[PDB]
Amino acid sequence: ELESQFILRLPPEYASTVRRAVQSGHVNLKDRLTIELHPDGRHGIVRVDRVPLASKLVDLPCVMESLKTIDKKTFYKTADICQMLVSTVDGDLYPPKKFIWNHGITLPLKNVRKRRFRKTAKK
Amino acid sequence: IIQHSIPAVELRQPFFPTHMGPIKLRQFHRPPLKKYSFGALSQPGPHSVQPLLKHIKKKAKMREQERQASGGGEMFFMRTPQDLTGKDGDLILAEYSEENGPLMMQVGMATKIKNYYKRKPGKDPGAPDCKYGETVYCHTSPFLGSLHPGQLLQAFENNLFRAPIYLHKMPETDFLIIRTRQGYYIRELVDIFVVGQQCPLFEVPGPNSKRANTHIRDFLQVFIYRLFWKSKDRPRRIRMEDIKKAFPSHSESSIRKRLKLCADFKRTGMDSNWWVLKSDFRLPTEEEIRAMVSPEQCCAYYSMIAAEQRLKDAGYGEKSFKIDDEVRTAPWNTTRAFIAAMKGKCLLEVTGVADPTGCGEGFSYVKIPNKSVAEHQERYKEECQRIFDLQNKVLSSTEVL
Amino acid sequence: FESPRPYKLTHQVVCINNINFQRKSVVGFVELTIFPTVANLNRIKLNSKQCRIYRVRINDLEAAFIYNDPTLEVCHSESKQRNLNYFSNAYAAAVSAVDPDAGNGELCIKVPSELWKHVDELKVLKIHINFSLDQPKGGLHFVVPSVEGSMAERGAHVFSCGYQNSTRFWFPCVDSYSELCTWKLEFTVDAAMVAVSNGDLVETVYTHDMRKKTFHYMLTIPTAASNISLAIGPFEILVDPYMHEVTHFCLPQLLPLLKHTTSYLHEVFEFYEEILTCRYPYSCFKTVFIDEAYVEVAAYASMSIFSTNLLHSAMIIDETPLTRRCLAQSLAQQFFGCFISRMSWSDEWVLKGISGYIYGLWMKKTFGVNEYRHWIKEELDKIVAYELKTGGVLLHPIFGGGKEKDNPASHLHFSIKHPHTLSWEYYSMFQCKAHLVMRLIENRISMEFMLQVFNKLLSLASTASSQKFQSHMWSQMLVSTSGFLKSISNVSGKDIQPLIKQWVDQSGVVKFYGSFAFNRKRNVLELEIKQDYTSPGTQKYVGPLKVTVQELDGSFNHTLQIEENSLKHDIPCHSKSRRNKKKKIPLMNGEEVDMDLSAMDADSPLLWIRIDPDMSVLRKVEFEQADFMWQYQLRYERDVVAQQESILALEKFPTPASRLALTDILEQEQCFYRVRMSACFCLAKIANSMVSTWTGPPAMKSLFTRMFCCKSCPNIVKTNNFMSFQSYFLQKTMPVAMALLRDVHNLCPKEVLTFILDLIKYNDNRKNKFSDNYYRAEMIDALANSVTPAVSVNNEVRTLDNLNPDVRLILEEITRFLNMEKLLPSYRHTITVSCLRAIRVLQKNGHVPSDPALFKSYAEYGHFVDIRIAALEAVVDYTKVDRSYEELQWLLNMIQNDPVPYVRHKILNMLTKNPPFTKNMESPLCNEALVDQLWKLMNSGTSHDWRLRCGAVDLYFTLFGLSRPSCL
């Protein structure tokens, strides 16, 4: 089956802690970072050192490709990425259009939906 | 010379899907996160997200040891579906600025980076070094606009398309999550490329064209042959039900056409019957099957049926494809416009409605004739150069908006 | 796998000193770095010729000295067995013994017992030899302008031409191939005169600070001895601008020609690494131009050294192929004279295979894919013609080891273990079969897989190169036939060992009596044709292949073949192509547009027969169709192959005027160039068949009418008709075939005569930017093809009529052009060459009398090669038909005595192609003493080069081959 990949966005202090954990390479990151998805498929809880952060699965506007390499010249495409799980420090952990993300991840692709996407003419 | 991975060249599933529904065509290259029915991650609650650092170093060591044991040089490693995973090796992200490109690579296909540089006049000490790609010194520009002296321009290169790429930094909050049935995986990644408008090198067919109808027939012929190679019975045999499950949009009579030359029908007293391979038919070998259908031909067909679904969703029936503005933006119209303009048969609209950015930062691939005639081609070059330089400035800028 | 050759070797150093221009000699010392293999390796053998050694030394110990030359004559000078077979066998065994590929001796320094106990201790030594090349009499060249006072300084150059293993003849080494070493090379040069060899400019300032310079070229890249050569004297031009390190060396006052010539080279390197996916696997590439060549091609390591005839300086259009054509060979063989390397002479053919095939691939994607296919057809022309002249050209893996022969291909001479037995006809056809067998490997295996194979080859080689000499683990650059085959089958194991044993290991050309039959001639049997073949002398039976047929407007029908060749076969039948007035074009081939019911179209649903249009099997296909089908194929076909073969088939028999019509129709479009040239010769033959059937006009004048408007051309076409190179070749060709047009009253081409004279009038000024040169040359050859044999009925040879009348006009024109090119001269005296051929053809009709003294005065020394070479062709035919003994004696004396190799090569080549004294037709009495001197020149005077006595072998092949010469 096709491997599923998506972007995980954290608050910067938690991103720095998890980044130091990834760069350290210790196994116990599997306890230090967990992801729980609710049955609605859009909300979740990302736990960093048992600290819950309320998370939202949003759809990225631009199609993104993740590619592998060995010699840094010929690249082999591994996956298509179009979704991002965004963790916030506030928000309902169990929540009872708003999942449409408007921006690129990179700096020049800000406001692509409103400024850099030609809109389809109906009829 | 592009050498794809072995599951890509072998036309394997699910890397090359056989049929895609209307939902799948709308979700083409945007796969939604879907729940499992079994496995570890089919269970509720939190799940462990495991590190990869020991696994990356071990695989890079082993592949280097396999290189040195036979006994150096260039070695091809993408032989299995397990070798195509994101769990190992050095990785990038590539974010396409186009919402729906005219040609797209599938999982498993290969592409190159060439570092196009134009030499400074007089004593050039050489091109600057980059982390990725191979330096190509060019006197004639491979794009619509011309390089400046001393300008380095990175670009993706394969048999499908040409498109400039721009190295940026991944944000400090963003990580790559690899999700399988068995667990969640995480890797650090810093290098992300912004990819501009494509310069297509392979022609996208039109709906129900002769080239498109030949491709569907040949891909059916490839899939039938590999079913015989998968069969372990002697003599080899397959079922009609297995082909219809992979090809629900084909009638059985169209499948009866492809099976009459190579197989003989043996009826059995059950609603499940076999096509037994003819004893005097030599089943074609693997590389002969490879020559029948290439990975590039599938992507051209995949681009057509996805865009045809988008036009039907927009209210355009089959009689529309004197031509509407959105129908001009179809990949069978843009690529035929560009390649003929690449071959010198015509010129391009460049300022026009088929601009994918919608704000003047891209090219409109619509044919205008070559028809005071040195000013006509100079104004084409001036309009090409302006937007090319503008696209270089915007997509490489680190300005925070 | 490994060499059966002991005493592995690593490094060698040359030091040329005291290179003379007056007594014309060279001195030098060599040092050698040897790891011996076994103890008691006492009589160590190296090999050279024409080398007086001054001293030998191993570590301040001058050890022993053995010096034979059995490369010279028979051990008894009057061995009366003066036939071929004994000499061939004896010479073969002799020079096999000269080879150190066995326990042998040419230079056997004996190891002393002191140094033998050192061998028992340490098998690592150095070898220091002082020696001096004399005047080199078969190894080198001292090109000297005959001035000797001052222009001997500025104007001379010095280099090494030679064959494969001519490094022997330059400085002593091994059997010079297949010994991986590295070299440091010290060069005592003039400060002006620049010397170029392999390797790199590693150490040179104004060197030794006294009066001269001294160059260090080090080749670190591990190669063999037959790549090394040193050209001394030219001028530097880096012709870099696109690839920065491309290095060129030419004589002064020849330099800006390179500025036109050298470029397009960058495109070639681009092409080659699109193939190979490496870089140019070296530091730099070096190219030397020279007024001489032992061989025009010659290509060595990082360096191709070849003639100053291939400049083609910007205005000289007809070397638009040739120059870069030969440049292509001088790159491709470069790589495989670089790295891939034969384990034996009996292992090579893959080398020249892949090299020539690669520049065939270049010829695809550089110019003329149709001219590519045309080139393939000429390859088959050469091969079929030669192996029906002669026996096969075989690619052994197989020895006659143990004094065994196993040589059906000994129709003249030895081949198995040796280069220096063969003919240039044989060696040329060896390369030609090399091209076409690689095309068969295309025919069984993907081009992409060919890229895969070659990349694996060069990956393993370049990996195995450029290291610290992995000891015992280094000979992977010997990439010969067996393991190469293994690597092929590792990429794709198919049934290519049948391909081998057909074509690599049965040197036979296959004709084809695929006999056309006609079923569905409203026949119950449906579309059937029989397969047939048998024709011995040189035959071969190849069975299972397929057959390519074009329908009316339909399928390329392809049909299997079998062995047991008394065969009848079918066609995958066309539809009922009926009501074909309505079925106008049901899709012939794409959107091609054609309509004729002109053929036998009651029941002819067929159009064209073909077997393997991509020219797989070495073929000479004989069959018959309806002539309508041939002519309609000439209306159009998508093969140049088909077009010129119907050109030949319709050159044989027919004359309708419809044939003429379709010929002219074929000539006036965009179809192909050389198609139209042979179409002109079609019109030549068929209008020569129009004697009683002069139905059409005086032909082809209308073609200059209807195709050529300068300013609408009021009845005469004159001016400035270039830049469209279709028309260039076409105007260059057509009036020759017009000068062929003859009908039997006196063959009377009088209108054509006067017309061609008028063509010679109306030549252009410098408005044509293209040096109106070859056009003159072929108008002159049209005059040479105004062959009028039958004027002198009784005695009119001898200034009698001041012989008459139009012959005299032709004489006026050729006299003019000879004196113009004495005054103007335009480009190689090419006009003068065509003139000399014309004057001989005038002697072959008895108008200017059969006197050689003109041609004799153009076979002299100080002219160009091409002049001299055409004069020698002429005087060879003179001694053929006329029975001049004395000039034959002169010819053989000059075969002995002249400095230029290539004239000796071509004298003997076309002397053997065009012989006098023809075997068992001996009126001019070779038996007297001519056999004696010829036997001498086989033995004596011919240790200069191999190929000169190889040509003498060809002489005794033709003249009295397999026997006593009927002397005693």
PDB file of C-alpha atoms in Angstrom, chain C residues 27-225:
ATOM      1  CA  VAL C  27      69.291   8.258 -28.054  1.00  0.00           C
ATOM      2  CA  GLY C  28      67.596   7.333 -24.817  1.00  0.00           C
ATOM      3  CA  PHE C  29      67.533   5.293 -21.648  1.00  0.00           C
ATOM      4  CA  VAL C  30      64.541   3.386 -20.345  1.00  0.00           C
ATOM      5  CA  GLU C  31      63.819   2.131 -16.855  1.00  0.00           C
ATOM      6  CA  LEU C  32      61.321  -0.565 -15.992  1.00  0.00           C
ATOM      7  CA  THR C  33      59.581  -1.529 -12.770  1.00  0.00           C
ATOM      8  CA  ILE C  34      58.988  -5.262 -12.573  1.00  0.00           C
ATOM      9  CA  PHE C  35      57.455  -7.712 -10.142  1.00  0.00           C
ATOM     10  CA  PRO C  36      58.559 -11.104 -11.483  1.00  0.00           C
ATOM     11  CA  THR C  37      56.225 -14.055 -11.147  1.00  0.00           C
ATOM     12  CA  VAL C  38      58.290 -17.211 -10.598  1.00  0.00           C
ATOM     13  CA  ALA C  39      61.905 -17.901  -9.730  1.00  0.00           C
ATOM     14  CA  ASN C  40      64.432 -18.944 -12.389  1.00  0.00           C
ATOM     15  CA  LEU C  41      62.919 -16.178 -14.518  1.00  0.00           C
ATOM     16  CA  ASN C  42      66.360 -15.756 -15.947  1.00  0.00           C
ATOM     17  CA  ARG C  43      66.189 -15.107 -19.701  1.00  0.00           C
ATOM     18  CA  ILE C  44      63.921 -12.088 -19.343  1.00  0.00           C
ATOM     19  CA  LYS C  45      62.544 -11.121 -22.747  1.00  0.00           C
ATOM     20  CA  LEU C  46      61.568  -7.752 -24.059  1.00  0.00           C
ATOM     21  CA  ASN C  47      61.197  -6.973 -27.710  1.00  0.00           C
ATOM     22  CA  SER C  48      61.960  -4.286 -30.290  1.00  0.00           C
ATOM     23  CA  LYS C  49      63.322  -3.902 -33.769  1.00  0.00           C
ATOM     24  CA  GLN C  50      65.792  -1.527 -35.429  1.00  0.00           C
ATOM     25  CA  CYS C  51      67.257  -0.777 -31.987  1.00  0.00           C
ATOM     26  CA  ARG C  52      70.970  -0.921 -31.334  1.00  0.00           C
ATOM     27  CA  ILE C  53      71.144  -1.198 -27.567  1.00  0.00           C
ATOM     28  CA  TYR C  54      74.013   0.656 -26.000  1.00  0.00           C
ATOM     29  CA  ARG C  55      74.000  -1.052 -22.630  1.00  0.00           C
ATOM     30  CA  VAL C  56      71.673  -2.991 -20.385  1.00  0.00           C
ATOM     31  CA  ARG C  57      71.706  -2.770 -16.595  1.00  0.00           C
ATOM     32  CA  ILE C  58      69.829  -4.044 -13.558  1.00  0.00           C
ATOM     33  CA  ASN C  59      70.875  -2.184 -10.392  1.00  0.00           C
ATOM     34  CA  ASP C  60      74.431  -1.344 -11.507  1.00  0.00           C
ATOM     35  CA  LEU C  61      74.788  -4.864 -12.908  1.00  0.00           C
ATOM     36  CA  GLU C  62      75.009  -5.132 -16.662  1.00  0.00           C
ATOM     37  CA  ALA C  63      73.579  -8.625 -17.075  1.00  0.00           C
ATOM     38  CA  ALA C  64      73.470 -10.681 -20.275  1.00  0.00           C
ATOM     39  CA  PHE C  65      72.237  -9.842 -23.737  1.00  0.00           C
ATOM     40  CA  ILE C  66      70.379 -11.759 -26.449  1.00  0.00           C
ATOM     41  CA  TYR C  67      69.353 -10.059 -29.693  1.00  0.00           C
ATOM     42  CA  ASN C  68      67.759 -11.927 -32.585  1.00  0.00           C
ATOM     43  CA  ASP C  69      65.779 -10.745 -35.584  1.00  0.00           C
ATOM     44  CA  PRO C  70      63.808 -13.699 -36.947  1.00  0.00           C
ATOM     45  CA  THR C  71      61.339 -11.087 -38.199  1.00  0.00           C
ATOM     46  CA  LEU C  72      63.807 -11.031 -41.087  1.00  0.00           C
ATOM     47  CA  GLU C  73      64.034 -13.697 -43.751  1.00  0.00           C
ATOM     48  CA  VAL C  74      64.085 -17.483 -43.810  1.00  0.00           C
ATOM     49  CA  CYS C  75      67.044 -19.025 -41.946  1.00  0.00           C
ATOM     50  CA  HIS C  76      68.335 -20.053 -45.369  1.00  0.00           C
ATOM     51  CA  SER C  77      68.064 -17.240 -47.888  1.00  0.00           C
ATOM     52  CA  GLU C  78      67.602 -19.649 -50.817  1.00  0.00           C
ATOM     53  CA  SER C  79      64.855 -21.846 -49.390  1.00  0.00           C
ATOM     54  CA  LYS C  80      63.514 -22.843 -52.799  1.00  0.00           C
ATOM     55  CA  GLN C  81      59.986 -23.493 -51.469  1.00  0.00           C
ATOM     56  CA  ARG C  82      58.988 -20.118 -52.859  1.00  0.00           C
ATOM     57  CA  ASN C  83      55.246 -20.510 -52.822  1.00  0.00           C
ATOM     58  CA  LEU C  84      52.572 -19.123 -50.574  1.00  0.00           C
ATOM     59  CA  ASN C  85      51.794 -21.902 -48.182  1.00  0.00           C
ATOM     60  CA  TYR C  86      55.218 -22.667 -46.758  1.00  0.00           C
ATOM     61  CA  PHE C  87      56.015 -18.968 -46.492  1.00  0.00           C
ATOM     62  CA  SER C  88      52.723 -18.071 -44.850  1.00  0.00           C
ATOM     63  CA  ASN C  89      53.024 -20.879 -42.324  1.00  0.00           C
ATOM     64  CA  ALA C  90      56.714 -20.294 -41.685  1.00  0.00           C
ATOM     65  CA  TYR C  91      56.276 -16.556 -41.296  1.00  0.00           C
ATOM     66  CA  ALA C  92      53.277 -17.137 -39.050  1.00  0.00           C
ATOM     67  CA  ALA C  93      55.222 -19.470 -36.787  1.00  0.00           C
ATOM     68  CA  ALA C  94      58.183 -17.105 -36.963  1.00  0.00           C
ATOM     69  CA  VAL C  95      56.441 -13.993 -35.794  1.00  0.00           C
ATOM     70  CA  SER C  96      54.436 -15.998 -33.267  1.00  0.00           C
ATOM     71  CA  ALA C  97      57.823 -16.987 -31.877  1.00  0.00           C
ATOM     72  CA  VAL C  98      58.834 -13.321 -32.031  1.00  0.00           C
ATOM     73  CA  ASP C  99      55.915 -12.662 -29.725  1.00  0.00           C
ATOM     74  CA  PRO C 100      56.776 -13.231 -26.056  1.00  0.00           C
ATOM     75  CA  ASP C 101      53.335 -14.835 -25.513  1.00  0.00           C
ATOM     76  CA  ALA C 102      55.297 -18.062 -24.782  1.00  0.00           C
ATOM     77  CA  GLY C 103      58.829 -18.824 -23.621  1.00  0.00           C
ATOM     78  CA  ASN C 104      60.608 -17.059 -26.450  1.00  0.00           C
ATOM     79  CA  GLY C 105      63.447 -14.703 -27.241  1.00  0.00           C
ATOM     80  CA  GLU C 106      64.148 -11.369 -28.882  1.00  0.00           C
ATOM     81  CA  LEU C 107      65.695  -9.484 -25.960  1.00  0.00           C
ATOM     82  CA  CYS C 108      66.570 -12.105 -23.355  1.00  0.00           C
ATOM     83  CA  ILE C 109      68.758 -10.522 -20.758  1.00  0.00           C
ATOM     84  CA  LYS C 110      69.836 -13.421 -18.577  1.00  0.00           C
ATOM     85  CA  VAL C 111      69.606 -12.870 -14.832  1.00  0.00           C
ATOM     86  CA  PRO C 112      72.934 -13.609 -13.100  1.00  0.00           C
ATOM     87  CA  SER C 113      73.047 -16.074 -10.230  1.00  0.00           C
ATOM     88  CA  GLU C 114      73.612 -13.182  -7.833  1.00  0.00           C
ATOM     89  CA  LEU C 115      70.446 -11.493  -9.018  1.00  0.00           C
ATOM     90  CA  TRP C 116      68.829 -14.936  -9.248  1.00  0.00           C
ATOM     91  CA  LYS C 117      69.381 -15.391  -5.518  1.00  0.00           C
ATOM     92  CA  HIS C 118      67.894 -11.929  -5.178  1.00  0.00           C
ATOM     93  CA  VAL C 119      64.870 -13.234  -7.133  1.00  0.00           C
ATOM     94  CA  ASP C 120      64.766 -16.034  -4.577  1.00  0.00           C
ATOM     95  CA  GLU C 121      64.732 -13.237  -2.009  1.00  0.00           C
ATOM     96  CA  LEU C 122      62.819 -10.376  -3.655  1.00  0.00           C
ATOM     97  CA  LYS C 123      60.909 -10.300  -6.917  1.00  0.00           C
ATOM     98  CA  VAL C 124      61.031  -6.507  -7.290  1.00  0.00           C
ATOM     99  CA  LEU C 125      63.461  -4.932  -9.743  1.00  0.00           C
ATOM    100  CA  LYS C 126      64.352  -1.925 -11.851  1.00  0.00           C
ATOM    101  CA  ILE C 127      65.778  -2.078 -15.378  1.00  0.00           C
ATOM    102  CA  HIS C 128      67.955   0.654 -16.902  1.00  0.00           C
ATOM    103  CA  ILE C 129      68.803   0.380 -20.598  1.00  0.00           C
ATOM    104  CA  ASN C 130      70.805   2.736 -22.741  1.00  0.00           C
ATOM    105  CA  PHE C 131      69.949   2.432 -26.419  1.00  0.00           C
ATOM    106  CA  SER C 132      69.834   4.468 -29.590  1.00  0.00           C
ATOM    107  CA  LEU C 133      67.397   4.551 -32.441  1.00  0.00           C
ATOM    108  CA  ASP C 134      69.275   5.029 -35.718  1.00  0.00           C
ATOM    109  CA  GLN C 135      67.738   6.603 -38.719  1.00  0.00           C
ATOM    110  CA  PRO C 136      64.354   4.955 -38.080  1.00  0.00           C
ATOM    111  CA  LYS C 137      63.625   2.702 -40.976  1.00  0.00           C
ATOM    112  CA  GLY C 138      60.124   1.622 -40.160  1.00  0.00           C
ATOM    113  CA  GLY C 139      59.285   2.907 -36.725  1.00  0.00           C
ATOM    114  CA  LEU C 140      59.195   6.675 -36.756  1.00  0.00           C
ATOM    115  CA  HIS C 141      59.089   9.714 -38.982  1.00  0.00           C
ATOM    116  CA  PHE C 142      61.338  12.711 -39.443  1.00  0.00           C
ATOM    117  CA  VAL C 143      59.298  14.865 -41.790  1.00  0.00           C
ATOM    118  CA  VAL C 144      61.907  17.175 -43.298  1.00  0.00           C
ATOM    119  CA  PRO C 145      61.365  19.943 -45.855  1.00  0.00           C
ATOM    120  CA  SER C 146      64.185  19.529 -48.340  1.00  0.00           C
ATOM    121  CA  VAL C 147      66.011  22.729 -47.388  1.00  0.00           C
ATOM    122  CA  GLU C 148      68.382  21.632 -44.560  1.00  0.00           C
ATOM    123  CA  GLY C 149      69.908  25.057 -43.954  1.00  0.00           C
ATOM    124  CA  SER C 150      67.400  27.063 -41.984  1.00  0.00           C
ATOM    125  CA  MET C 151      63.961  25.644 -42.747  1.00  0.00           C
ATOM    126  CA  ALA C 152      65.149  22.411 -41.149  1.00  0.00           C
ATOM    127  CA  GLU C 153      64.656  24.379 -37.942  1.00  0.00           C
ATOM    128  CA  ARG C 154      61.305  25.961 -38.752  1.00  0.00           C
ATOM    129  CA  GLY C 155      59.447  23.620 -41.049  1.00  0.00           C
ATOM    130  CA  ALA C 156      60.214  20.098 -39.945  1.00  0.00           C
ATOM    131  CA  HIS C 157      58.452  17.854 -37.526  1.00  0.00           C
ATOM    132  CA  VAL C 158      59.056  14.481 -35.918  1.00  0.00           C
ATOM    133  CA  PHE C 159      56.606  11.851 -34.708  1.00  0.00           C
ATOM    134  CA  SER C 160      55.749   8.160 -34.628  1.00  0.00           C
ATOM    135  CA  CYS C 161      53.380   6.634 -37.106  1.00  0.00           C
ATOM    136  CA  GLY C 162      52.792   2.940 -36.995  1.00  0.00           C
ATOM    137  CA  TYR C 163      50.277   0.163 -36.621  1.00  0.00           C
ATOM    138  CA  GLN C 164      49.027  -1.393 -33.335  1.00  0.00           C
ATOM    139  CA  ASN C 165      52.206  -3.049 -32.140  1.00  0.00           C
ATOM    140  CA  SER C 166      54.696  -0.605 -33.546  1.00  0.00           C
ATOM    141  CA  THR C 167      55.851   0.436 -30.076  1.00  0.00           C
ATOM    142  CA  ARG C 168      58.326  -2.414 -30.599  1.00  0.00           C
ATOM    143  CA  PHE C 169      59.695  -0.483 -33.535  1.00  0.00           C
ATOM    144  CA  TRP C 170      60.036   2.627 -31.379  1.00  0.00           C
ATOM    145  CA  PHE C 171      61.343   1.500 -27.980  1.00  0.00           C
ATOM    146  CA  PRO C 172      61.677  -1.973 -26.451  1.00  0.00           C
ATOM    147  CA  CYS C 173      58.754  -3.369 -24.484  1.00  0.00           C
ATOM    148  CA  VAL C 174      56.536  -6.467 -24.138  1.00  0.00           C
ATOM    149  CA  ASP C 175      54.112  -7.845 -26.619  1.00  0.00           C
ATOM    150  CA  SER C 176      53.041  -4.293 -26.425  1.00  0.00           C
ATOM    151  CA  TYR C 177      49.359  -4.687 -25.718  1.00  0.00           C
ATOM    152  CA  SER C 178      47.778  -5.991 -22.506  1.00  0.00           C
ATOM    153  CA  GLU C 179      50.384  -4.873 -19.952  1.00  0.00           C
ATOM    154  CA  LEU C 180      48.900  -2.311 -17.574  1.00  0.00           C
ATOM    155  CA  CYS C 181      51.540   0.241 -16.658  1.00  0.00           C
ATOM    156  CA  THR C 182      52.061   3.908 -15.939  1.00  0.00           C
ATOM    157  CA  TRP C 183      54.701   6.173 -17.345  1.00  0.00           C
ATOM    158  CA  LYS C 184      56.977   9.098 -16.708  1.00  0.00           C
ATOM    159  CA  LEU C 185      58.284  10.507 -19.939  1.00  0.00           C
ATOM    160  CA  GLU C 186      61.243  12.843 -20.386  1.00  0.00           C
ATOM    161  CA  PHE C 187      61.525  14.742 -23.637  1.00  0.00           C
ATOM    162  CA  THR C 188      64.618  16.585 -24.904  1.00  0.00           C
ATOM    163  CA  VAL C 189      62.998  19.179 -27.148  1.00  0.00           C
ATOM    164  CA  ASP C 190      63.810  22.426 -28.833  1.00  0.00           C
ATOM    165  CA  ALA C 191      62.480  25.429 -26.949  1.00  0.00           C
ATOM    166  CA  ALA C 192      60.278  26.139 -29.950  1.00  0.00           C
ATOM    167  CA  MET C 193      59.480  22.569 -30.953  1.00  0.00           C
ATOM    168  CA  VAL C 194      56.700  21.187 -28.785  1.00  0.00           C
ATOM    169  CA  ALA C 195      56.393  17.449 -28.188  1.00  0.00           C
ATOM    170  CA  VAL C 196      53.087  15.812 -27.324  1.00  0.00           C
ATOM    171  CA  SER C 197      52.459  12.359 -25.925  1.00  0.00           C
ATOM    172  CA  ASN C 198      50.090  10.677 -23.520  1.00  0.00           C
ATOM    173  CA  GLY C 199      49.543  11.805 -19.990  1.00  0.00           C
ATOM    174  CA  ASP C 200      50.067  15.202 -18.500  1.00  0.00           C
ATOM    175  CA  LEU C 201      52.252  18.332 -18.509  1.00  0.00           C
ATOM    176  CA  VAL C 202      53.562  17.461 -15.094  1.00  0.00           C
ATOM    177  CA  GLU C 203      56.967  19.169 -14.934  1.00  0.00           C
ATOM    178  CA  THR C 204      58.107  21.849 -17.405  1.00  0.00           C
ATOM    179  CA  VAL C 205      59.503  25.362 -16.959  1.00  0.00           C
ATOM    180  CA  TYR C 206      62.149  26.710 -19.229  1.00  0.00           C
ATOM    181  CA  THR C 207      63.816  23.437 -18.486  1.00  0.00           C
ATOM    182  CA  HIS C 208      67.529  22.633 -17.787  1.00  0.00           C
ATOM    183  CA  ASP C 209      68.321  26.355 -18.338  1.00  0.00           C
ATOM    184  CA  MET C 210      71.013  25.745 -20.984  1.00  0.00           C
ATOM    185  CA  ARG C 211      69.730  26.023 -24.567  1.00  0.00           C
ATOM    186  CA  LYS C 212      66.701  23.750 -25.022  1.00  0.00           C
ATOM    187  CA  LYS C 213      63.648  22.503 -23.149  1.00  0.00           C
ATOM    188  CA  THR C 214      62.688  19.187 -21.615  1.00  0.00           C
ATOM    189  CA  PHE C 215      59.173  17.945 -21.030  1.00  0.00           C
ATOM    190  CA  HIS C 216      57.775  15.651 -18.375  1.00  0.00           C
ATOM    191  CA  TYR C 217      54.624  13.902 -19.470  1.00  0.00           C
ATOM    192  CA  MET C 218      53.403  11.599 -16.767  1.00  0.00           C
ATOM    193  CA  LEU C 219      50.571   9.228 -17.485  1.00  0.00           C
ATOM    194  CA  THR C 220      49.240   8.212 -14.107  1.00  0.00           C
ATOM    195  CA  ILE C 221      46.214   6.526 -15.686  1.00  0.00           C
ATOM    196  CA  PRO C 222      47.143   2.844 -16.043  1.00  0.00           C
ATOM    197  CA  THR C 223      47.509   1.992 -19.731  1.00  0.00           C
ATOM    198  CA  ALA C 224      49.511  -0.221 -22.098  1.00  0.00           C
ATOM    199  CA  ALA C 225      52.474   0.441 -24.314  1.00  0.00           C
TER     200      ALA C 225
END
